[PDB]
Amino acid sequence: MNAPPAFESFLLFEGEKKITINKDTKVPNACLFTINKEDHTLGNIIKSQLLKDPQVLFAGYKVPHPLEHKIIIRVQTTPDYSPQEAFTNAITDLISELSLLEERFRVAIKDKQEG
Amino acid sequence: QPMIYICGECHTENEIKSRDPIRCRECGYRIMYKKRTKRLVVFDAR
Amino acid sequence: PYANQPTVRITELTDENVKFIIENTDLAVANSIRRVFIAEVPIIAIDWVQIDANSSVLHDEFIAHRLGLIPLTSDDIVDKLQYSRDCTCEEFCPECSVEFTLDVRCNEDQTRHVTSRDLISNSPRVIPVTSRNEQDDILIVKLRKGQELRLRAYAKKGFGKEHAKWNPTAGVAFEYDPDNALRHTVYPKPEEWPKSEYSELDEDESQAPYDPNGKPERFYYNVESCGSLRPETIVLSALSGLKKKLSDLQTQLSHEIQSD
Amino acid sequence: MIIPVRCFTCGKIVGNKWEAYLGLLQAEYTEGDALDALGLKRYCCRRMLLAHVDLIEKLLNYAPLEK
Amino acid sequence: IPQIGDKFASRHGQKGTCGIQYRQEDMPFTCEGITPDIIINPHAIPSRMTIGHLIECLQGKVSANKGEIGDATPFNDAVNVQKISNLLSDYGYHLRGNEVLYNGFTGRKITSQIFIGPTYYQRL
Ligand SMILES: [Zn+2]
Ligand SMILES: [Zn+2]
Ligand SMILES: [Zn+2]
Numbered sequence: 001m002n003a004p005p006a007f008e009s010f011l012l013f014e015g016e017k018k019i020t021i022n023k024d025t026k027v028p029n030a031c032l033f034t035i036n037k038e039d040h041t042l043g044n045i046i047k048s049q050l051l052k053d054p055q056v057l058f059a060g061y062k063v064p065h066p067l068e069h070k071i072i073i074r075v076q077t078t079p080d081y082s083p084q085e086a087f088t089n090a091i092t093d094l095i096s097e098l099s100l101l102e103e104r105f106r107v108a109i110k111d112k113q114e115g
Numbered sequence: 116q117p118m119i120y121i122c123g124e125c126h127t128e129n130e131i132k133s134r135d136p137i138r139c140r141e142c143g144y145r146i147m148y149k150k151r152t153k154r155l156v157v158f159d160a161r
Numbered sequence: 162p163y164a165n166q167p168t169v170r171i172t173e174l175t176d177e178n179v180k181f182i183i184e185n186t187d188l189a190v191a192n193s194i195r196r197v198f199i200a201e202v203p204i205i206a207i208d209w210v211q212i213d214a215n216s217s218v219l220h221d222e223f224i225a226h227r228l229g230l231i232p233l234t235s236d237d238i239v240d241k242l243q244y245s246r247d248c249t250c251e252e253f254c255p256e257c258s259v260e261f262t263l264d265v266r267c268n269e270d271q272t273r274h275v276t277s278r279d280l281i282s283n284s285p286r287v288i289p290v291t292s293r294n295e296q297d298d299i300l301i302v303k304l305r306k307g308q309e310l311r312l313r314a315y316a317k318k319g320f321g322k323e324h325a326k327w328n329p330t331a332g333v334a335f336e337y338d339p340d341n342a343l344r345h346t347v348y349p350k351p352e353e354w355p356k357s358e359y360s361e362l363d364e365d366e367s368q369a370p371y372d373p374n375g376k377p378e379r380f381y382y383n384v385e386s387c388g389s390l391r392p393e394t395i396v397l398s399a400l401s402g403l404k405k406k407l408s409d410l411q412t413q414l415s416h417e418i419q420s421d
Numbered sequence: 422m423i424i425p426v427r428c429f430t431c432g433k434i435v436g437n438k439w440e441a442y443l444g445l446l447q448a449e450y451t452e453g454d455a456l457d458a459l460g461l462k463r464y465c466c467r468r469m470l471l472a473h474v475d476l477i478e479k480l481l482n483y484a485p486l487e488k
Numbered sequence: 489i490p491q492i493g494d495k496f497a498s499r500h501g502q503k504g505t506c507g508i509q510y511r512q513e514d515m516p517f518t519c520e521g522i523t524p525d526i527i528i529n530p531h532a533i534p535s536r537m538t539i540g541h542l543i544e545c546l547q548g549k550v551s552a553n554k555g556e557i558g559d560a561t562p563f564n565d566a567v568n569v570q571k572i573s574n575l576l577s578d579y580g581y582h583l584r585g586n587e588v589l590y591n592g593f594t595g596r597k598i599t600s601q602i603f604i605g606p607t608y609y610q611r612l
Pocket of ligand 1: 122123124125126127139140141142143144
């Protein structure tokens with residue numbers, strides 16, 4: 001009667017942007033990234049990778065409503081740095097980490113099956 | 116057009132037209148069931 | 162400001178589960194990997210049923226739901242098939258779906274067990290796991306003499322976010338800091354609690370001394386497979402899926418940055 | 422009415438274990454040992470097999486609608 | 489199919505509607521990846537004093553781990569909480585039915601060890 005289709009958690013609606021960047025006016029060098037059709041899976045890793053950047057002053061995320069299917073990630077960096085650049089570098093670092101983890105898991109599987 | 120029904124007691128496929136008392140021709144039982152439609156109903160296995 | 166250099170150590174690899182350890186990674190990465198095991202590792206499962214005849218004691222949606230939860234071998238085919246969203250065909254085609262047929266009739270006096278062995282596929286690679294060449298076959302329905310079940314299913318590509326039938330795991334044990342050194346738990350009576358299988362403590366010692374400078378490292382995993390994928394295929398597909406989620410996010414990020 | 426396919430909690434397949442479970446029980450296994458023989462180690466799957474009531478066997482005592 | 493707003497009840501007067509449904513990766517999990525089918529609020533216990541709910545949960549954990557059916561007949565001196573706890577401690581569990589759970593969203597351990605186990609629920 002009121003059950004949303006299960007794909008609405010993963011699929012973007014037509015004309016709906018995957019990610020939107022909005023300047024935070026309260027403090028300088030801060031941005032809000034509203035990412036649609038993602039959840040804690042990417043939010044937590046992006047936040048925790050951003051916390052590894054010493055040029056990042058704030059890194060947090062929230063799912064504003066569990067029934068809704070977006071996350072907001074707030075990133076504040078030092079003045080010489082940018083929150084967009086920080087977010088990009090965090091994603092790049094996560095991708096490199098996962099590539100290395102995948103190659104090493106392939107090697108470990110090969111060793112385990114062989115000996 | 117035929118509207119074949121099944122008997123509740125003898126399970127016999129028998130045709131009955133409108134304005135006809137509901138009686139199985141094989142055993143006279145008074146309760147009949149319609150057969151499953153031929154239309155194509157789809158289920159999402161969820 | 163840069164990526165981790167995680168290492169891996171697989172401590173057990175069977176056809177049923179994989180038990181491994183990831184070290185030198187963040188807890189968020191470990192838990193996102195754990196979540197992707199459950200919710201973003203695609204597999205093949207029946208997601209469309211057409212009941213041509215069902216004289217069984219279970220109604221049509223019961224049979225359909227029951228067929229959807231039968232695991233189908235998805236190892237090499239799931240990467241090749243497309244989502245029906247992405248397929249440029251009609252409702253179905255062999256590029257985005259797999260056809261199954263089931264046609265059973267109980268004529269004999271003993272009860273006929275309509276099992277997953279009766280799910281006949283057009284694709285030899287995508288078959289019910291129990292039907293793969295021990296464990297018995299999954300029971301779809303029991304039929305009495307004169308009862309009959311004839312249906313036509315189509316299996317699709319999906320993951321556990323959409324429905325648990327596309328979840329490839331039969332349990333994902335995840336653990337870290339087996340000895341409570343980070344004190345992320347606070348036992349009122351630490352002596353009362355059993356020791357983890359990964360604990361390295363003498364029996365007199367209940368929990369490790371508190372580590373003020375500690376961070377969660379060395380996450381232990383036991384990924385049990387429902388049958389569709391091999392456990393190591395579940396882990397590899399999870400890592401690839403998480404990496405493609407991040408890559409797509411970065412692509413959209415670049416479009417948003419350059420459009421500003 | 423019939424043995425579920427998956428364990429509600431973890432999603433382990435239990436549909437193929439009901440008949441084997443009954444065969445082990447008539448083989449003079451205890452329910453715990455039978456559940457151990459089938460590889461149900463989490464108490465959720467043990468719940469699934471141990472608390473199941475096979476009502477379909479009673480529904481098959483009624484003649485079908487068509488012969 | 490059960491949904492938000494459907495009424496469920498245990499056998500102890502503990503009724504309530506489904507507030508929300510989380511997927512298995514969003515629910516909290518034990519070290520062996522068991523997620524709860526249902527999560528009920530601890531504040532429903534103290535005023536109500538439905539200790540039978542807790543004893544049934546603990547007895548049910550013992551029953552599921554032992555392969556038996558628990559005897560909850562009302563006035564039975566051969567079955568008390570200490571015996572059930574001693575039985576549960578033999579299966580590698582905290583004797584009082586608590587377990588370390590992990591946050592499904594972040595994977596971090598929950599500081600307070602949660603009371604979890606099989607309980608018979610009813611859909612109304
Ligand atoms: Zn008749
Ligand atoms: Zn197609
Ligand atoms: Zn289970």
